Design an enzyme around this catalytic site. Structure first.
Site, mmCIF file in Angstrom:
data_model
loop_
_atom_site.group_PDB
_atom_site.id
_atom_site.type_symbol
_atom_site.label_atom_id
_atom_site.label_comp_id
_atom_site.label_asym_id
_atom_site.label_seq_id
_atom_site.Cartn_x
_atom_site.Cartn_y
_atom_site.Cartn_z
ATOM 1 C CB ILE A 16 -0.961 -0.023 1.196
ATOM 2 C CG1 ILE A 16 -1.810 -1.297 1.104
ATOM 3 C CG2 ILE A 16 -1.825 1.274 1.225
ATOM 4 C CD1 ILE A 16 -2.515 -1.439 -0.264
ATOM 5 C CB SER A 20 7.997 8.609 8.287
ATOM 6 O OG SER A 20 6.769 8.668 8.998
ATOM 7 C CB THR A 23 6.401 -1.161 4.139
ATOM 8 O OG1 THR A 23 7.566 -0.372 3.849
ATOM 9 C CG2 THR A 23 5.663 -1.474 2.845
ATOM 10 C CB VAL A 24 0.700 -0.391 5.215
ATOM 11 C CG1 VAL A 24 -0.667 -1.062 5.150
ATOM 12 C CG2 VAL A 24 0.916 0.283 6.588
ATOM 13 C CE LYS A 36 1.533 1.317 10.025
ATOM 14 N NZ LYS A 36 1.353 2.610 10.752
ATOM 15 C CG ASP A 127 2.062 10.167 14.411
ATOM 16 O OD1 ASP A 127 2.070 10.957 13.438
ATOM 17 O OD2 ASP A 127 3.065 9.539 14.796
HETATM 18 C C1 LIG Z 1 -2.526 2.310 5.699
HETATM 19 C C2 LIG Z 1 -3.585 1.316 6.207
HETATM 20 C C3 LIG Z 1 -3.437 0.752 7.490
HETATM 21 N N1 LIG Z 1 -2.369 1.120 8.284
HETATM 22 C C4 LIG Z 1 -2.069 0.562 9.520
HETATM 23 C C5 LIG Z 1 -1.645 -0.775 9.601
HETATM 24 F F1 LIG Z 1 -1.586 -1.473 8.457
HETATM 25 C C6 LIG Z 1 -1.311 -1.360 10.845
HETATM 26 C C7 LIG Z 1 -1.389 -0.577 12.022
HETATM 27 C C8 LIG Z 1 -1.820 0.769 11.938
HETATM 28 N N2 LIG Z 1 -1.915 1.568 13.058
HETATM 29 S S1 LIG Z 1 -1.519 1.135 14.554
HETATM 30 O O1 LIG Z 1 -1.620 2.266 15.498
HETATM 31 O O2 LIG Z 1 -0.274 0.373 14.617
HETATM 32 C C9 LIG Z 1 -2.868 -0.026 15.004
HETATM 33 C C10 LIG Z 1 -4.193 0.707 15.254
HETATM 34 C C11 LIG Z 1 -5.270 -0.258 15.758
HETATM 35 F F2 LIG Z 1 -4.805 -0.938 16.802
HETATM 36 C C12 LIG Z 1 -2.161 1.323 10.694
HETATM 37 CL CL1 LIG Z 1 -2.665 2.966 10.578
HETATM 38 C C13 LIG Z 1 -4.380 -0.168 8.012
HETATM 39 C C14 LIG Z 1 -5.485 -0.540 7.218
HETATM 40 C C15 LIG Z 1 -5.636 0.018 5.931
HETATM 41 N N3 LIG Z 1 -6.739 -0.359 5.162
HETATM 42 C C16 LIG Z 1 -6.901 0.137 3.971
HETATM 43 N N4 LIG Z 1 -6.044 1.045 3.387
HETATM 44 C C17 LIG Z 1 -6.322 1.551 2.021
HETATM 45 C C18 LIG Z 1 -4.917 1.507 4.023
HETATM 46 O O3 LIG Z 1 -4.188 2.321 3.454
HETATM 47 C C19 LIG Z 1 -4.692 0.943 5.416
#
Ligand SMILES: Cc1c(Nc2c(F)ccc(NS(=O)(=O)CCCF)c2Cl)ccc2ncn(C)c(=O)c12
Length: 272
Positions: A16, A20, A23-24, A36, A127
């Site tokens: 995705i 910074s 990588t997701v 992530k 954040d």
């Molecule tokens: C960019 C993204 C993420 N990012 C993501 C992630 F993969 C793992 C952790 C966290 N955040 S965390 O604080 O570690 C945990 C918080 C809850 F506990 C976040 Cl933000 C997640 C789902 C997504 N689904 C669809 N799309 C289009 C995306 O781009 C997308």
């Protein structure tokens, strides 16, 4: 820890983006997930990471991105639900989705609802920004990227320099300076929310007339730069424009907290 997904269960898919911090990827683990992946840890770092996962394990709310598990192999990783849709940043600034005002207000309401939940759980997000607020199925706000605050902020090699560049627009003056007592607070989260409100109600990032990110860092940190509220769309309710100025107050003690913010948004939504 029982929230570790055993290695060999997750299948990685589409990349995705590489931010910074990590990588997701889209992934498969009992269906669609997001994965992530962090840096390519010592026993002390592994224990600290598990402690941070303890914070994620506290969150169970439909406006909070759903934590599902973590991995340690091949690398430290956080697994969450996959959101069907795009981030608010993508909608507003990349593909320029034209939301009706009633829906912009609802997105603000749902975001405040998630933030209120975090604060009730004694979690400072630290954040918040529009690219970690996801519009799931084009209907439900999911707030992510509040996990691993100590890993993100304190570990050597967590790309803090890059994180600053990516987050400056949402960062309260006292978080820029880090000089005041307890620079991260409920109030600094409110300020970041105020910037998200600015994005929703103008369609623009703040300070788009200032080309230089260093001038932004210095000016906001000095209490000398605030978003141009004249850019709010003509049908934005006056109560919502007032609320946005309250959240953006340079003096953090002047900012409302999220119970008050939610009540203000809910009142103006139910006043239409
Ligand atoms: C960019 C993204 C993420 N990012 C993501 C992630 F993969 C793992 C952790 C966290 N955040 S965390 O604080 O570690 C945990 C918080 C809850 F506990 C976040 Cl933000 C997640 C789902 C997504 N689904 C669809 N799309 C289009 C995306 O781009 C997308």
């Amino acid at each position: 820890d029982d929230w570790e997904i055993p290695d060999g269960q997750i299948t990685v898919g589409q990349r995705i983006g590489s931010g910074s911090f990590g990588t997701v990827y889209k992934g498969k683990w009992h269906g669609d997930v997001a994965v992530k992946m962090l840096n390519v840890p010592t026993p002390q770092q592994l224990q600290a990471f598990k402690n941070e996962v303890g914070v994620l394990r506290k969150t169970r709310h439909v406006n909070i991105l759903l934590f599902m598990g973590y991995s340690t192999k091949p690398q430290l990783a956080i697994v969450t639900q996959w959101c069907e849709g795009s981030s608010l940043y993508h909608h507003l600034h990349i593909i320029e989705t034209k939301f009706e005002m009633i829906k912009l207000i609802d997105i603000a309401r749902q975001t405040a609802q998630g933030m209120d939940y975090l604060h009730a759980k004694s979690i400072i997000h630290r954040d918040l920004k529009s690219n970690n607020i996801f519009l799931h199925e084009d209907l439900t706000v999911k707030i992510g990227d509040f996990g691993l605050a100590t890993v993100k902020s304190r570990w050597s090699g967590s790309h803090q320099f890059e994180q600053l560049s990516g987050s400056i627009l949402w960062m309260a003056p006292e978080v820029i300076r880090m000089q005041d007592k307890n620079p991260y607070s409920f109030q600094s989260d409110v300020y970041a929310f105020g910037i998200v409100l600015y994005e929703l109600m103008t369609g623009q990032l703040p300070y788009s007339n200032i080309n230089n990110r260093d001038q932004i860092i210095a000016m906001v940190g000095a209490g000398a730069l605030s978003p141009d509220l004249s850019k709010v769309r003509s049908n934005c309710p006056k109560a919502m424009k007032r609320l946005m100025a309250e959240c953006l107050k340079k003096k953090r003690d002047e900012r409302p907290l999220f119970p008050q913010i939610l009540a203000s948004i809910e009142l103006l939504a139910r006043s239409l």
